[PDB]
Amino acid sequence: GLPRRIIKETQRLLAEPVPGIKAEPDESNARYFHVVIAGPQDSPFEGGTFKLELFLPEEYPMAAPKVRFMTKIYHPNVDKLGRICLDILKDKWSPALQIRTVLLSIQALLSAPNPDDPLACDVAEQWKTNEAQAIETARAWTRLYAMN
Amino acid sequence: MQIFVKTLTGKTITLEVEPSDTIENVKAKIQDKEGIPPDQQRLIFAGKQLEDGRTLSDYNIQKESTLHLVLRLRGG
């Protein structure tokens, strides 16, 4: 039985989009959605076309939608294989929340990292050791892996 | 000037303000009209966090611009 709330999330982002963000549904699956965050203005990641892919679980919209960060990125809140460590993808989900706010709060994650609650701890200790260095390294990784 | 907000769960609201108003003031106006306390709100402009004691001017926000919003606890 296909749930309506699933396709709604698509039909809304087609009707009304989020500036900096382009995305696409799949003909094969309404529970799986394809996304590119245009990288942020005046950022170490400025110029990157970060791809990601998104899944809507059988519980949705009583619990969270999951997401994998499919372009390489060097940052405090992303695990060695693309797992995005952001709490909103876990904690206190509700039906008021949309695939719209999920994509906006990961646009936020690129534009504003957290080095006070990290999971890539080697990058957090780089950002405490020298911010400008972490900036060069994030740029060097953007230019090598993200510009297509 | 007037500017807008269009992200929550199926609502628009509007913001009538000057170009040198702080974002801490803007937050107070959103608490004044949607109820959300100023520490919970984070406002975003084009994949960009709006820092609390800066202004419309510092982000180069202008007439008819549209902000969006995410809610947390720590931070501003």
Swiss-Prot record, chain A:
Domain UBC core span(s) in chain numbering: 1-147
Superkingdom as given in the UniProt entry: Eukaryota
Pfam families xref list: UQ_con
Listed pathway(s): Protein modification; protein ubiquitination
An example Gene Ontology CC term for this record: ubiquitin conjugating enzyme complex
Biological processes, Gene Ontology terms: antiviral innate immune response; DNA double-strand break processing; double-strand break repair via homologous recombination; negative regulation of TORC1 signaling; positive regulation of canonical NF-kappaB signal transduction; positive regulation of DNA repair; positive regulation of double-strand break repair; positive regulation of intracellular signal transduction
Compartment(s) of residence: Nucleus; Cytoplasm
Catalytic residues identified in the record: 85 (glycyl thioester intermediate)
Cross-link (Glycyl lysine isopeptide (Lys-Gly) (interchain with G-Cter in ISG15)): 90
PTM annotation: Conjugation to ISG15 impairs formation of the thioester bond with ubiquitin but not interaction with UBE2V2.
Keyword Glycoprotein: no
PANTHER family referenced in this protein's UniProt entry, alphabetically: UBIQUITIN-CONJUGATING ENZYME E2 (PTHR24068)
Protein family (similarity comment): Belongs to the ubiquitin-conjugating enzyme family.
Protein name according to UniProt: Ubiquitin-conjugating enzyme E2 N
Organism: Homo sapiens (Human)
Organism lineage string: Eukaryota, Metazoa, Chordata, Craniata, Vertebrata
Gene: UBE2N
From Swiss-Prot, chain B:
Resulting phenotype, residue 74 to K: No effect on ADP-ribosylation
Site description Interacts with activating enzyme, residues in chain: 54, 72
UniProt modified residues of type Phosphoserine: 65
Outcome of mutating residue 63 to R: Abolishes HLTF-mediated polyubiquitination of PCNA
Residues the record lists as ADP-ribosylglycine modifications: 76
Outcome of swapping residue 65 to G: Phosphomimetic mutant that can recruit PRKN to mitochondria
Post-translational modification: Phosphorylated at Ser-65 by PINK1 during mitophagy. Phosphorylated ubiquitin specifically binds and activates parkin (PRKN), triggering mitophagy. Phosphorylation does not affect E1-mediated E2 charging of ubiquitin but affects discharging of E2 enzymes to form polyubiquitin chains. It also affects deubiquitination by deubiquitinase enzymes such as USP30. Mono-ADP-ribosylated at the C-terminus by PARP9, a component of the PPAR9-DTX3L complex. ADP-ribosylation requires processing by E1 and E2 enzymes and prevents ubiquitin conjugation to substrates such as histones.
Domain of life (superkingdom): Eukaryota
Marked site (Essential for function) residue numbers: 68
Glycyl lysine isopeptide (Gly-Lys) (interchain with K-? in acceptor proteins) cross-link, chain position(s): 76
Crosslinked positions (Glycyl lysine isopeptide (Lys-Gly) (interchain with G-Cter in ubiquitin)): 6, 11, 27, 29, 33, 48, 63
(Microbial infection) ADP-ribosylthreonine: modified positions: 66
Localisation: Cytoplasm; Nucleus
Domain Ubiquitin-like: 1-76
The protein's role, per its UniProt record: Exists either covalently attached to another protein, or free (unanchored). When covalently bound, it is conjugated to target proteins via an isopeptide bond either as a monomer (monoubiquitin), a polymer linked via different Lys residues of the ubiquitin (polyubiquitin chains) or a linear polymer linked via the initiator Met of the ubiquitin (linear polyubiquitin chains).
Protein's name in the database: Ubiquitin
Organism: Homo sapiens
Source lineage: Eukaryota, Metazoa, Chordata, Craniata, Vertebrata
GN (gene name): RPS27A
Shown stretch of the complete protein: 1 to 76 of 156
